[PDB]
Design a protein around this motif. Sequence first.
Motif, PDB file in Angstrom:
ATOM      1  N   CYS A  83       0.846  -1.184   0.000  1.00  0.00           N
ATOM      2  CA  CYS A  83       0.000   0.000   0.000  1.00  0.00           C
ATOM      3  C   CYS A  83       0.885   1.240   0.000  1.00  0.00           C
ATOM      4  O   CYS A  83       2.098   1.115  -0.058  1.00  0.00           O
ATOM      5  N   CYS A 135       0.793   3.773   2.575  1.00  0.00           N
ATOM      6  CA  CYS A 135       1.311   3.957   3.930  1.00  0.00           C
ATOM      7  C   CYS A 135       1.931   2.658   4.457  1.00  0.00           C
ATOM      8  O   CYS A 135       2.924   2.696   5.174  1.00  0.00           O
ATOM      9  N   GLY A 136       1.346   1.514   4.105  1.00  0.00           N
ATOM     10  CA  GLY A 136       1.930   0.243   4.503  1.00  0.00           C
ATOM     11  C   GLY A 136       1.198  -0.543   5.574  1.00  0.00           C
ATOM     12  O   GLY A 136       1.782  -1.484   6.097  1.00  0.00           O
ATOM     13  N   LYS A 137      -0.046  -0.201   5.905  1.00  0.00           N
ATOM     14  CA  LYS A 137      -0.796  -0.927   6.948  1.00  0.00           C
ATOM     15  C   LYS A 137      -0.900  -2.436   6.652  1.00  0.00           C
ATOM     16  O   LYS A 137      -0.861  -3.262   7.558  1.00  0.00           O
ATOM     17  N   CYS A 171      -7.321  -0.569   2.481  1.00  0.00           N
ATOM     18  CA  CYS A 171      -6.799  -0.027   3.743  1.00  0.00           C
ATOM     19  C   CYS A 171      -7.792   0.938   4.453  1.00  0.00           C
ATOM     20  O   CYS A 171      -8.329   1.881   3.858  1.00  0.00           O
ATOM     21  N   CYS A 185      -6.604   4.619   4.561  1.00  0.00           N
ATOM     22  CA  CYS A 185      -6.302   5.130   3.234  1.00  0.00           C
ATOM     23  C   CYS A 185      -6.652   4.081   2.161  1.00  0.00           C
ATOM     24  O   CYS A 185      -6.572   2.907   2.435  1.00  0.00           O
TER      25      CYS A 185
HETATM   26 ZN   LIG Z   1      -2.536   2.605   3.691  1.00  0.00          ZN
END
Ligand SMILES: [Zn+2]
Lengths: 158, 158, 341, 48, 345
Positions: free
Chosen positions: A5, A7-9, A20, A23
């Motif tokens: 993603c 942000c990386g969640k 996500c 986001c």
């Molecule tokens: Zn994200």
Amino acid sequence: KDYECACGKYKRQRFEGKVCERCGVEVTKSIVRRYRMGHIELATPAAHIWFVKDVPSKIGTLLDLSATELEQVLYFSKYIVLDPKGAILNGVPVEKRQLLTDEEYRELRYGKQETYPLPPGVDALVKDGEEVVKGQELAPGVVSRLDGVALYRFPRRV
Amino acid sequence: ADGGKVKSDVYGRVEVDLVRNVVRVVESYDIDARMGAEAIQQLLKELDLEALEKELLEEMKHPSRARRAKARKRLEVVRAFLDSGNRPEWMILEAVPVLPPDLRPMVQVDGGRFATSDLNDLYRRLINRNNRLKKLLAQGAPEIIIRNEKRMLQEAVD
Amino acid sequence: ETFPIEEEDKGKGGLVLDFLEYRLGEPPFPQDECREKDLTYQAPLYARLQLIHKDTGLIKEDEVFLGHIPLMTEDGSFIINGADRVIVSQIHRSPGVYFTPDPARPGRYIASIIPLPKRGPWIDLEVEPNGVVSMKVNKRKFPLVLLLRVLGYDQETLARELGAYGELVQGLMDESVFAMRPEEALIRLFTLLRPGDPPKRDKAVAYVYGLIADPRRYDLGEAGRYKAEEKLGIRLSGRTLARFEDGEFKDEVFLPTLRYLFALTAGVPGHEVDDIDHLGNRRIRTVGELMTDQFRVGLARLARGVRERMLMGSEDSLTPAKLVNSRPLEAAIREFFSRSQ
Amino acid sequence: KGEDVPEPSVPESFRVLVKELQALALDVQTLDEKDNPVDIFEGLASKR
Amino acid sequence: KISTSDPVRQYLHEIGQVPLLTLEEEVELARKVEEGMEAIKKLSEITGLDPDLIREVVRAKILGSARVRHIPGLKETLDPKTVEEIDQKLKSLPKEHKRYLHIAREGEAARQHLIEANLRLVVSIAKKYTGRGLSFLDLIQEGNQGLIRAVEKFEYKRRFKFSTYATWWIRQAINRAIADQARTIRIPVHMVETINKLSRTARQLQQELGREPTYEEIAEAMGPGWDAKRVEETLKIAQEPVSLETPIGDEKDSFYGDFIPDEHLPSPVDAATQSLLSEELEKALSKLSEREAMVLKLRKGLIDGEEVGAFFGVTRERIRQIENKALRKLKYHESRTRKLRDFLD
Ligand SMILES: [Zn+2]
């Protein structure tokens, strides 16, 4: 990015089909970034030139208008076509599909004639005009009397 | 109504001068006057192709070759539209599809040069104009400037 | 060609920048060093310049090195950037006047006056007798006589001496209404051109098809006058059709072309048919010419911006920096040795 | 892995076209046996 | 036909029919514009309605019907019923407040009128900020937006006329626009003047050296904190992008994009990599004790890159214990059956 993603969640394949929480990013590689489409929402429409300017104007053909010139006329610039109804006359009845000019169109919406002639000095025409201006209906050609001849050549009141 | 737009009888505008009780009433009525894709979008939705189909059918085989010939070329388009496929209100654009991103790249070249599909400079054209439009409507709207923009907008969409 | 920059009036002027002597002499680096290191072997050039004034004073700012111009190796090749380069010669229609058969109508042939540089008219003489004659500079035609009249050739003297042996003379004396007013014919032709221009402009446009620019500064004597005396017409007074002494122009070239047309169409003065591909018609551009041209194009670019600064510089100290900027000549000449096809 | 090469997926030339074509008003949709959709852009066109 | 000429004629014709007289007409309209405000406010005062609403209903009645409210602004004000209700209360305002209603409209009107008349002013101004990177029509239009801005703040009480006032409010609008839209990659106003100064400096530097300044001069001449790194950086952003689509090589038919390669995309070589790598890594991952192998497999290969925070309840001593003892038993048998040694990277 690949399966990750922004942000990386969430970052791998196990949850490949979800988006996500904070986001929005559903992922397979950046190919989704090259196949997806967005749209712009136009204020007041405009037309496809692919249909307006092909030799037979497909809209000119279908809409009985000047197949090539009535279009160009109203499309890009201000030459109005009376769409549904317009009671008042030009000399003849409302032109159901005909187009008119700014000038005459102007003469329509506000009133037949606009004449603002403002006098040169303080005592000569200021008096001729005043005496006959406030409540007196001034007929066409009202010959105001001082600087040269202030000519009021049109209709009703002043 | 106050002194801009008010339709009473056949006369249609009404100015107000609270000096003496004077209700200035100008005379031109509700004249639907439109220019740009706005006007053609209307005309396009109102048409019942079936009617024009039948009307042209008669125009086709009955009058002499001059107006019937034009009608046969004009029946072509109307037929397909109705035949199979989709209906004609769509030729008008109000929602511009945007080409994907990776297809209109933004890339790091050399030292720092960047290369972008020319399509993106056009897109910005449209968006800026579209927005400036919205803001010009909201700010307040002097006619010349609104159209002026709408013209630019149109061109841009081309 | 582009040094005497005459800039007179729009505000204050009377500018006169004059060329004295050109000198280039000390190469920055040497050949091999130019190949080891990425270098362009070019000789440095700064000529002497002195700008005049309408007020007492003439400041002479000696040198300004603008333009580093490549040199030739003793073999004949160059060294632009790392690699040795060569300027290949070229071929084209040599700037003259010929007569070629008409396009589609098998009938009769038409005349052509070829003036290179590009900016500079391209004339053609064609007669279509039901009522019109055609002489075209940029495009739209006008009478062949309205012009002769302007210069001073009147219906009687023209028709009789040039075309007595040429009955075609009758198409020349045809529109007499206009042929009865001399200098007014000058204004009237001006009218024919089309912008919506001031009728009054004493001798300005006539100048252009007269002495300086469009016609050419190719050597006075053999450059164009060769194509003349042998092919058609005998004399040239001033390189190309040129003069600005009395306001009244002289044209020893405009009549001979028609003269040869009436001649070529009427028999054997000689046999006037020009095979274009004849090499006396096709000229070879040797290196020098190819560089001198880009050199003058640059000079123009330079002279363009300098004019702007004849108005920008406050008072008289404007000789060095105020008039010269080496950016044009560099890019210009440099572009020719590295980017020219 | 010594497996016989796979059976071709849609070429990008095609996809680039369709979208280029979508870039203009036109709608290019592939169809089924019976005139019904089918999908070239494997799963990247459905929304969200 | 061709766009510039039509608009020029368009507003130049109307100004030609209605220029504003120097004092009278500007004063007149101005006076009306302000009274409109004073009116709308007092209207809000006795209606309890937001000055924003009183302003949009008088606009609708003077500038346009349901048509202009429905398309521009989507739909929250009912095309007919809504705005009309509002107009009704305005009518109910007796002799005293009704006056404000009648005033608001006429003022709104003057606003528009004052705006029309001063369109030549824009064009004349906008005429000079031409070659900045914006279309003349775009420039005039932004500038136009500027004039509308001036109309909102001019105080006729302060005798100066709209001319000098519009100039500023327009010049501001334009310059902003030039700085906001001119480039493909947005650059704030400060960077802009920065770049102008850089440019102007390089100009003064070109003046005498005969040497297009090394980025040393530029730093010096510019001022306080200017260095080589800064100038090389600034001029790097100053260069507009290039047309990914430009005529290339010999200009015949060369489009600048078939030559750039692609990076994300795994060239076959890489797809084969991930296959063996993941199949072999997956085989190892299974033959091991889950406790600390998965911990470090998942902590390193599943989320992000914390010895202590890596294991569930069992503290560090058992982490390092199994991590280093399983990792080595795993590497040393992998040393036996050499599969991983040929560094997959
Ligand atoms: Zn994200």
